[PDB]
Design a protein around this ligand. Structure first.
Ligand SMILES: [Mg+2]
Ligand SMILES: [Mg+2]
Ligand SMILES: [Mg+2]
Ligand SMILES: [Mg+2]
Ligand SMILES: [Mg+2]
Ligand SMILES: [Mg+2]
Ligand SMILES: [Mg+2]
Ligand SMILES: [Mg+2]
Ligand SMILES: [Mg+2]
Ligand SMILES: [Mg+2]
Ligand SMILES: [Mg+2]
Ligand SMILES: [Mg+2]
Ligand SMILES: [Mg+2]
Ligand SMILES: [Mg+2]
Ligand SMILES: [Mg+2]
Ligand SMILES: [Mg+2]
Ligand SMILES: [Mg+2]
Ligand SMILES: [Mg+2]
Lengths: 123, 392, 45, 322, 101, 176
RNA sequence: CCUCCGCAUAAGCCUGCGUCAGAUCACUGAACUGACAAUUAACAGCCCAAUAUCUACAAUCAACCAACAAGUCAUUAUUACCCUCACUGUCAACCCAACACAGGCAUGCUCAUAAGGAAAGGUUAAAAAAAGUAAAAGGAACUCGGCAAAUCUUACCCC
RNA sequence: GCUACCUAAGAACAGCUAAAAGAGCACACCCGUCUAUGUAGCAAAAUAGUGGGAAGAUUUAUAGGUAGAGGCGACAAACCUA
RNA sequence: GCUAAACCUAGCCCCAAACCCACUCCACCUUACUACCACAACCUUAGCCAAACCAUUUACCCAAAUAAAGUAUAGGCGAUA
């Protein structure tokens, strides 16, 4: 006879308490006789770098001078990545409206391991 | 009168939107927004195929599409088959004549008092009492618990005679082994697939019981027939099969000879348990199958009368009633009814004990019958030992 | 003796007065709609 | 409410704890054509007998390893029956359960309506060994009672719960493999096969490479104490009326490739706090490292069959009551 | 990582990875007497014991032998001036048994 | 090791720890892509230390040495995440012209209100999905009256707000 | 001195007599407030590739016998199939009756306890009232009626 | 989620006599004959004692169904959240 | 002398003007707030009440305020419309 409390896996009868969980992402499946099969590949792997000889530390010196905040946009990214290559190739006759893929553009995301839309990677 | 009422079946899909009929135009459907709405038309979807294979979500080919599919129907006899006519049917299929009682050779084995084990009666009763009363924690053990354990202990008991007989060192008992044997009878294709544990395996084949004169005498006898029952009734009628004769072992297996097949009826329910007649049928076909498999291995795939017959024997039990069979396969040309016939000696309804009391019966505060086996007879164990000591 | 008419269970509570039970019929939908307009914090069990 | 003691356990360092519960000192060491029959059983399961349904890697321990161990025990006992007349008459069981129930130590209930009352800890061990051999006459002891040893019983600081161990209430059982009315009450040898969950290559996958020997050891101590413990009870001995002779049994624990051997002597059932207060007498368990029986099996032969392992199986079977 | 949509896997897929992991840990002093090898942790709900194993041995190079978890229920008994229940949040507790003794 | 869940023993229970300023978004933008990834784990370990330190103070019933550190650390990582997010977002625009990483649609729930429905991933196509087809992404007519009442309600609240604004200005004029 | 209660599971409830500090029929305290702790899976939940195809004979110690209301439990053929122990429940003196209510409340084990409990705030010994125990001689004379207490009867009539 | 009835899949019934039964005595359980207490009570129907049944048309746990111009009913105008 | 008493401002009401909000990450129609597998919507309002009962009947928002006009007309030619 309570409506206002949050509904949880603690709360039902036996069957109910089995079915619901907390938020944890499942990492396998079940087979006959309730045997759990784990898939190694479904388990997230921590991609953790080498920290040896690394100068950056978690806090910053106050002695550092202040600079104006300017966020990143597509326009300026194009200007400081693609634009110099394009204009340099515009000077000669190497540039082409077709096959501009040389500059880093891709027609499709289908083949890629890291597909941008829809996103297929974690963080 | 057709079966399956109308309400239970999958409902006939609703009639198509009338827009689809008009040849000029294509309908506006709710395909575009990826959900149902009632006002737009129902789209027709092209059938879908998962491009990759996934084991859990697998759909098998139609039955014609399987590689092993054949127009000619093979009939398979397995462990769960139950013959309608029993031994009568079994004999027909295996082309055999039965003889009541065991062979004289095996009965002569328990003739001498020497071959008897020390404290035979004491031991046998102990086996029954261990299996049937003292076994587990709970008071009254069930059949599937007591049936294999009683046989295991009776095998152990016979196996103690190694002291007396060195020949017993030349055998093993194997579990979870399988045989396959295929033949023809009036150009019906039949295949026996034998499953189940407790196969007695020896380095040496059994010598033949019956003489060549006996084998020649079988020719005059005619196989018994039953009408209007077909001899193929109660066998798994199969269109998808492969023909193979298998002894269940790879080439160069030590102990490759089938001495005895032990068969159990470890079923709790009466309807689940085979009838006595039906069980004797099962062991005939199994013994035949095991003998025929071995015959095909070393004598080839030809249909002929063998110069030296193969002997296999079998024991079938429920834990209480025992059936003993000796089988002799002397011929492989089985397609025609007339000629040389295989041989079978059978003893049936030989029960080890009449009843068993787990708990003492008290009527008016006095014990009518005490705990234990009731109506025990040792002659059935003698027969069991006789079959064990054969070929030793 | 009376008063103990409520003999509780989670299964029964949910199958009778739950969100899925509510949305199952148009009548129930309107029940939810009402509670939303009134500003109830419990729309259903 | 009793603790459920699991003989075959995933608990880290579970040998230490089991020694506490049973008051057991663990000691390192011990107190022909058989090769042909041994390797033939290996080849039977692995090679010679062909399988209709394909063998999965999870099912291999139950379908390959288990029927192998079934086979080896039954053959060796029959073959050695002329050597040892005891084994001729001996009864052997396949997957028969064994139960023992004892009390050791006390607690004060921390919370509830019974808070601050004295209570005793109950331990129940239920085990189903793959094979066991029972005899009518007791085996002779290894060492006498009051056999002082200069090695201390392990003591656990915290609650028994902190090693993952759980309390449950059910039927309290003493059982030797058969009921009381069976004359073969005394215990010869147990054969255990470890579950596929406690396999060594899985244990190498977790960082716990040092725990492979713990699993073997822990199984022995618990299951043997249970078995001898139960036998002593069938002779009328219990907590207050402690044993007047030693009760001995021996065990063979395997994973199908690696074999361990153990001998157990039970000297005392005085485990209850009141009984234990003044009693220097201890239970003793002997054991050795796991050794591979065979290196590998390819086609039709076994590579690097180690004979001494097979003989240690023989030497245990050869033991007879005097 | 938590509060992100995990990309689906089909057989023969690429190995799922995280590069920056939302999970944050506290190592806490146990309220009950423990074995010396056992150490206690407060853990995000959505974290698994598999995750915590990998987390510790990955980032901290701590070899672990065994991990067991449980979900601690925070009390909802407390009430404010407006007589409304104040919920103390539920958290996950992970016990880690270290390896190599 | 497990030891690095705690800071340097020399500064244990020191009442005050001198700590640096939180990283700025600008500073992090100058930093390399790979280097941000490395810095991010440096910030991870630091967070966990401070979180365990928070809890230990809470247990001992003592004040934390420098609680503001935690805030700084948090902010730095917020900043870092934002910086990285920006890069991904930028690249998406240049490659696909999609503003949102996860696909979705404007839909009409049964309550007749317009929602941004986010998609989920499935193995099978939508028409074959039993659970998905159970959902109603449309409003039947009976809902329209409620939509009216809802609107009217919103209007009332708004009207009330406006009035009070004016009234307040009036009294503020009489006092000044 | 009492125990027809207890211990456990289920069902229901949701931190609801653990620790520490203030604070207030009874302690100036606790079943009050705040802060801090805790319940670790082996038990239990959470399952299963496909298309055909199989499945006449109860249970009751299942034996003899005996029925009627006719009964909880089985596959085979071929194809496909190699990775492992994840997730959730686990506390308490507790639930439904507005209440710390002589009421309600399923199963297992203990059938009297090894477990769990306390009828008397202090006194005095009035009346009337409630529940007992005993009672000379008599034995229904009481009363609508042997109601009640007793005692632990017999023969009928109406329906 | 009470109660009336049904559906699915369960569970319970000691001891003693009985030619063996919708049998008899009699626990647990289910019901409520008669008396007294209670009557803002322990209780919006209880308690103490005494009684009826207690292997059956029995009792009972779980889930589902039938809805008011109606349901359900071994008909009491009974029951369908005091 | 206790218990008390006393307060002005939160806000709100009716107008006018003007056509409104639908919203970081995650989750949410299965037992909502739960990562992850082969049916469908449109269908005369009735009644209280008035008629001193009641039975035909009895005002109810339809797109310019005023006036035409409570007029023509309808109605158990009556209530009334
Ligand atoms: Mg009920
Ligand atoms: Mg758990
Ligand atoms: Mg389990
Ligand atoms: Mg007590
Ligand atoms: Mg009192
Ligand atoms: Mg008084
Ligand atoms: Mg008086
Ligand atoms: Mg008198
Ligand atoms: Mg009179
Ligand atoms: Mg008178
Ligand atoms: Mg009377
Ligand atoms: Mg009725
Ligand atoms: Mg009766
Ligand atoms: Mg009666
Ligand atoms: Mg009437
Ligand atoms: Mg009447
Ligand atoms: Mg009127
Ligand atoms: Mg009037």
């Amino acid at each position: 006879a309570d409506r206002m409390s949050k509904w949880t896996s603690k709360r039902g009868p036996r069957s109910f308490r089995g079915r619901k969980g907390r938020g944890a992402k499942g990492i396998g499946f079940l087979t006959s006789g309730w045997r759990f099969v784990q898939i190694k590949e479904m388990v997230p792997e921590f991609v953790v770098p080498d920290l040896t000889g690394f100068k950056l530390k978690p806090y910053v010196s106050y002695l550092a001078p202040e600079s104006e905040e300017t966020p990143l946009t597509a326009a300026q990214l194009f200007s400081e990545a693609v634009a110099p290559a394009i204009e340099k190739d515009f000077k000669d006759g190497t540039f082409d409206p077709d096959n501009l893929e040389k500059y880093g553009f891709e027609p499709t995301q289908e083949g890629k391991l890291f597909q941008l839309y829809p996103r297929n990677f974690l963080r | 009168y057709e079966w399956g009422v109308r309400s239970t079946r999958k409902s006939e899909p609703p009639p198509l939107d009338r827009v689809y009929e008009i040849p000029g135009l294509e309908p506006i459907t709710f395909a575009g927004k990826m959900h149902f709405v009632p006002w737009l038309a129902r789209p027709i979807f092209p059938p879908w195929d998962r491009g990759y294979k996934d084991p859990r979500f697998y759909r098998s080919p139609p039955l014609h599409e399987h590689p092993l599919y054949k127009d000619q129907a093979c009939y398979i006899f397995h462990h769960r088959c139950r013959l309608l006519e029993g031994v009568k049917q079994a004999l027909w299929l295996t082309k055999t004549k039965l003889i009541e009682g065991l062979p004289e050779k095996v009965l002569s084995l328990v003739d001498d008092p020497r071959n008897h084990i020390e404290n035979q009666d004491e031991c046998v009763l102990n086996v029954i009492s261990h299996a049937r009363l003292w076994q587990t924690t709970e008071e009254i053990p069930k059949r599937e618990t007591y049936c294999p354990v009683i046989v295991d202990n009776l095998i152990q008991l016979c196996k103690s005679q190694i002291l007396k007989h060195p020949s017993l060192a030349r055998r093993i008992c194997v579990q979870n082994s399988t045989f396959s044997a295929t033949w023809n009878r009036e150009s019906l294709l039949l295949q026996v697939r034998g499953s189940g544990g407790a196969r007695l395996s020896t380095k040496d084949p059994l010598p033949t019981i019956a003489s060549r004169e006996e084998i020649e005498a079988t020719k005059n006898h005619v196989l018994e027939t039953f009408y209007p029952i077909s001899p193929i009734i109660d066998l798994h009628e199969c269109n998808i099969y492969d023909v193979k004769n298998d002894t269940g072992f790879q080439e160069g297996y030590p102990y490759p000879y089938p001495h005895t097949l032990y068969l159990l009826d470890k079923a709790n329910l009466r309807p689940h348990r085979l009838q006595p007649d039906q069980l004797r049928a099962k062991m005939i076909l199994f013994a035949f199958g095991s003998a025929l498999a071995q015959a095909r291995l070393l004598y080839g795939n030809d249909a002929k009368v063998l110069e030296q017959p193969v002997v296999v024997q079998s024991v079938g039990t429920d834990g209480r009633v025992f059936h003993f069979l000796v089988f002799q396969l002397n011929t492989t040309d089985l397609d025609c009814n007339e000629g040389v016939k295989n041989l079978a000696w059978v003893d049936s309804d030989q029960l080890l004990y009449q009843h068993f009391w787990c708990l003492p019966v008290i009527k008016k505060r006095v014990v009518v019958e005490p705990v234990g086996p009731v109506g025990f007879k040792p002659e059935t164990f003698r027969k069991f030992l006789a079959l064990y000591l054969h070929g030793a | 003796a009376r008063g103990n008419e409520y003999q509780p269970s989670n299964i029964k509570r949910k199958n009778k007065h739950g969100w899925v039970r509510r949305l199952s019929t148009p009548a129930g939908v309107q029940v939810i709609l009402r509670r939303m307009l009134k500003g109830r914090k419990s729309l259903s069990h | 409410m009793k603790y459920m003691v699991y003989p075959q356990t995933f608990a880290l360092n579970a040998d230490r704890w089991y020694q506490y519960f049973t008051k057991t000192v663990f000691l390192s060491g011990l107190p022909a054509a058989l090769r042909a029959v041994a390797c033939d059983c290996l080849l039977q399961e692995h090679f010679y007998l062909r399988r209709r349904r394909r063998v999965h890697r999870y099912e291999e321990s139950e379908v390959i390893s288990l029927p192998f161990l079934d086979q080896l025990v039954s053959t060796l006992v029959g073959l050695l029956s002329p050597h040892n007349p005891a084994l001729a008459a001996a009864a052997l069981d396949y997957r028969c359960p064994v139960h023992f129930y004892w009390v050791r130590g006390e607690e004060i209930i921390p919370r509830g309506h019974r808070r601050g009352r004295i209570d005793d800890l109950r331990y129940q061990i239920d085990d189903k060994p793959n094979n066991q051999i029972r005899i009518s006459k007791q085996l002779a002891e290894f060492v006498p009672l009051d056999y002082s040893v200069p090695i201390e019983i392990p003591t656990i600081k915290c609650k028994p719960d902190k090693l993952p161990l759980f309390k449950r209430q059910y039927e309290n059982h003493i059982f030797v493999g058969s009921k009381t009315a069976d004359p073969c009450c005394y215990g010869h040898t147990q054969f255990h096969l470890l579950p596929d969950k406690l396999r060594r290559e899985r244990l190498l996958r977790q960082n716990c490479a040092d725990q492979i020997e713990v699993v073997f050891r822990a199984n022995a101590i618990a299951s043997l104490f249970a078995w001898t413990g139960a036998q002593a009870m069938y002779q009328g001995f219990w907590s207050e009326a402690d044993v007047t002779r030693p009760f001995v049994s021996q065990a063979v624990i395997t994973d199908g490739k690696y074999f361990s051997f153990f001998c157990y002597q039970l000297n005392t059932l005085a485990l209850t706090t009141q009984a234990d207060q003044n009693n220097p007498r201890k239970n003793i368990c002997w054991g050795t490292q796991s050794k591979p029986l065979y290196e590998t099996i390819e086609d039709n032969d076994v590579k690097g069959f180690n004979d001494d392992v097979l003989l240690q199986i023989v030497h245990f079977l050869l033991n007879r009551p005097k | 990582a938590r509060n992100v949509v995990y990309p689906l896997y089909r057989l023969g897929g690429p190995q799922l990875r995280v590069f920056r992991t939302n999970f944050f840990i506290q190592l806490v002093r146990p309220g009950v007497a423990q074995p010396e090898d056992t150490v206690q942790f407060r853990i995000p709900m959505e974290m698994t014991r598999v995750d915590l194993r990998n987390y510790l041995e990955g980032i901290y190079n701590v070899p672990v032998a065994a991990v067991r978890t449980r979900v601690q229920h925070g009390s909802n008994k407390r009430r404010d001036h407006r007589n409304v229940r104040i919920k103390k949040p539920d958290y996950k507790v992970a016990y880690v048994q270290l390896a190599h003794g | 090791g497990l030891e690095e869940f705690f800071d340097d023993p020399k500064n244990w229970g020191q009442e005050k720890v001198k700590s640096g300023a939180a990283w700025t978004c600008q500073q992090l933008r100058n930093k390399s892509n790979e280097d941000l990834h490395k810095l991010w784990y440096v910030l991870l370990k630091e967070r966990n230390m401070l979180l365990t330190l928070e809890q230990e103070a809470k247990r001992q019933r003592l004040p934390m040495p420098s609680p503001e550190r935690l805030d700084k650390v948090v902010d730095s990582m917020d900043a870092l995440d934002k910086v990285v997010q920006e890069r991904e977002d930028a690249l998406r625009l240049l490659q696909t012209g999609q503003e949102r990483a996860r696909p979705g649609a404007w839909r009409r729930d049964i309550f007749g209100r317009i929602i941004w429905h986010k998609f989920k991933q499935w193995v099978i196509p939508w028409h074959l999905n039993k659970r998905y087809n159970r959902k109603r992404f449309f409003a039947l007519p009976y809902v329209d009256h409620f939509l009216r009442l809802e609107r009217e309600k919103r209007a009332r609240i708004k009207a009330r707000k406006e009035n009070l604004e004016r009234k307040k200005a009036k009294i503020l004029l009489k006092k000044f």
